[PDB]
Amino acid sequence: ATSTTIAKHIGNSNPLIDHHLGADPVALTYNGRVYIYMSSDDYEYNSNGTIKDNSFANLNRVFVISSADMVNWTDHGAIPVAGANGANGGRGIAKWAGASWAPSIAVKKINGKDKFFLYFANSGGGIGVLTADSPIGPWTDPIGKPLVTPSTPGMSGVVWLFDPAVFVDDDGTGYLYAGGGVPGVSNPTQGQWANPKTARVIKLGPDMTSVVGSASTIDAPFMFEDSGLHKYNGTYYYSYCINFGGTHPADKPPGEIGYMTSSSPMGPFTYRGHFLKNPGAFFGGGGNNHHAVFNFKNEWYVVYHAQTVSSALFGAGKGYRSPHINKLVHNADGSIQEVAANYAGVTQISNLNPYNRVEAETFAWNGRILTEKSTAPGGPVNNQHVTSIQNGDWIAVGNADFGAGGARSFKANVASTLGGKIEVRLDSADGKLVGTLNVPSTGGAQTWREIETAVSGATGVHKVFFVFTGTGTGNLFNFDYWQFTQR
Numbered sequence: 001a002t003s004t005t006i007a008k009h010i011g012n013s014n015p016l017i018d019h020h021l022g023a024d025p026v027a028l029t030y031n032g033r034v035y036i037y038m039s040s041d042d043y044e045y046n047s048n049g050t051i052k053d054n055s056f057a058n059l060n061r062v063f064v065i066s067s068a069d070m071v072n073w074t075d076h077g078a079i080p081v082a083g084a085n086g087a088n089g090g091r092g093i094a095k096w097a098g099a100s101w102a103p104s105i106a107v108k109k110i111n112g113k114d115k116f117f118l119y120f121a122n123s124g125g126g127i128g129v130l131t132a133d134s135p136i137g138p139w140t141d142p143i144g145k146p147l148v149t150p151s152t153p154g155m156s157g158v159v160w161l162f163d164p165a166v167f168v169d170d171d172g173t174g175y176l177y178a179g180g181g182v183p184g185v186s187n188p189t190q191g192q193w194a195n196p197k198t199a200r201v202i203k204l205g206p207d208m209t210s211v212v213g214s215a216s217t218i219d220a221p222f223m224f225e226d227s228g229l230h231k232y233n234g235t236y237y238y239s240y241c242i243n244f245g246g247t248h249p250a251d252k253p254p255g256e257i258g259y260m261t262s263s264s265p266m267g268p269f270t271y272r273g274h275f276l277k278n279p280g281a282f283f284g285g286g287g288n289n290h291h292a293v294f295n296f297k298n299e300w301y302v303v304y305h306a307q308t309v310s311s312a313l314f315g316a317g318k319g320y321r322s323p324h325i326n327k328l329v330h331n332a333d334g335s336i337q338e339v340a341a342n343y344a345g346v347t348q349i350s351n352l353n354p355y356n357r358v359e360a361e362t363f364a365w366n367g368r369i370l371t372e373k374s375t376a377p378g379g380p381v382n383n384q385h386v387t388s389i390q391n392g393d394w395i396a397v398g399n400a401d402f403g404a405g406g407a408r409s410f411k412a413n414v415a416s417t418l419g420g421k422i423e424v425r426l427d428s429a430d431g432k433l434v435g436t437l438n439v440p441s442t443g444g445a446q447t448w449r450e451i452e453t454a455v456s457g458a459t460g461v462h463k464v465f466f467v468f469t470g471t472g473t474g475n476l477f478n479f480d481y482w483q484f485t486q487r
């Protein structure tokens with residue numbers, strides 16, 4: 001193992017991923033997994049190949065990763081949401097949309113079946129929705145135009161009609177929160193900074209792809225963007241990013257996550273405080289806050305973004321954002337403690353079972369690979385593979401539990417022009433070697449075989465490292481999934 005981690009270091013849980021970016025995260029919790037959906041931040045370049053600042057040019061997909069344990073993330077690739085103009089090479093789903101910013105996600109049981117709803121902003125003018133029968137697609141545009149526009153009743157007044165947050169209440173009623181911006185164009189007055197009156201909530205129809213009635217204004221003091229809604233102990237918590245302009249009182253600090261409570265989903269809301277500092281307070285930082293509060297496996301968390309990967313690569317964030325999660329604590333009085341955002345992140349919640357098929361693109365740490373959509377036969381929806389594998393690269397999973405009996409063999413599904421090796425190591429990238437898998441030439445990068453090799457000494461709970469070696473100077477092979485067999 002020679003390659004180093006970019007930003008998510010072995011033993012740490014933030015950023016969630018560092019083999020690519022992901023901005024504006026939101027969480028769905030569903031049947032033992034947490035799914036994180038993100039705007040498609042993607043490095044932009046000058047014509048001479050040098051990196052430039054993020055201009056949001058490429059925000060036309062939604063990236064999706066998921067975990068059962070907070071440490072190992074399955075990369076589910078990208079949903080080609082935007083279909084207008086050039087976007088997504090004709091494969092875009094929402095043909096009316098040139099952009100798909102800042103996703104929101106909901107599940108609702110309809111006609112005895114779980115149905116999933118992905119919301120997004122077509123830049124600053126309109127919210128769209130796609131539907132699917134699984135949290136990872138495939139996705140359908142059931143409307144063919146925006147769900148919400150400035151003409152939706154109650155939506156006039158909104159400066160930036162974006163950053164949707166959709167919540168399905170306990171009674172099954174869906175609600176959409178959206179909006180932000182500050183009125184007064186180039187020079188808002190002090191009062192316009194303090195009360196933009198640009199946040200909205202509107203009830204959704206039963207189908208989750210329509211609205212009922214008109215939108216209500218939520219008077220979020222110093223509103224900026226990044227609506228969020230969670231419900232704790234019967235109270236609805238509307239959270240949002242506080243703006244950066246005007247003078248601010250001590251209790252509404254610029255760029256921080258403010259929150260309000262109500263006994264009803266549409267209000268009236270009352271400001272209660274703030275619980276997440278600007279990312280640059282912790283990682284410095286740079287730039288805008290975006291967040292979502294969620295409960296997964298019976299603990300409260302917040303997912304948010306920071307410029308921690310681009311920072312480590314370039315020596316500046318440059319507007320490129322990565323997801324992080326930390327714990328969130330409600331007090332006895334219903335108030336929320338300041339979130340202690342950091343790199344350590346959340347300690348692994350459960351062990352990984354190495355005797356099922358595990359996607360190669362399910363990993364906790366890597367140095368340094370990419371994931372992309374795979375040509376491998378079979379596999380889960382939107383199956384990906386690990387690629388850009390060179391000599392000395394590796395990926396690793398957290399706490400695989402081999403059990404006291406331990407493993408007998410190791411299978412890997414691979415595609416290779418010239419061949420190479422996968423070393424299986426415990427605990428560290430130079431750790432106990434339990435097996436070495438020889439990847440043959442298979443026919444090339446799109447031709448697949450499952451290879452088996454012997455394993456010995458794999459028992460108990462260990463980080464497992466897959467270390468890639470070979471004589472080539474570029475990509476050695478593509479790696480789709482693996483599985484151990486029990487002794």
Ligand SMILES: O[C@@H]1[C@@H](O)[C@H](O[C@@H]2CO[C@@H](O[C@@H]3CO[C@@H](O)[C@H](O)[C@H]3O)[C@H](O)[C@H]2O)OC[C@H]1O
Nearest residue numbers: 123124125160161162225244255286287288289
């Ligand atoms: O002070 C800085 C802030 O301005 C910054 O917030 C960003 C402001 O621009 C927003 O992008 C607009 C979204 O709406 C579209 O219609 C417009 O075309 C966009 O320009 C963006 O949402 C914010 O993140 O954050 C960093 C602060 O220091």
Ligand SMILES: [Ca+2]
Nearest residue numbers: 359384385480
């Ligand atoms: Ca795969």
Ligand code: NA
Nearest residue numbers: 024026102103
């Ligand atoms: Na969001």
Ligand code: NA
Nearest residue numbers: 368369388390
């Ligand atoms: Na690599």
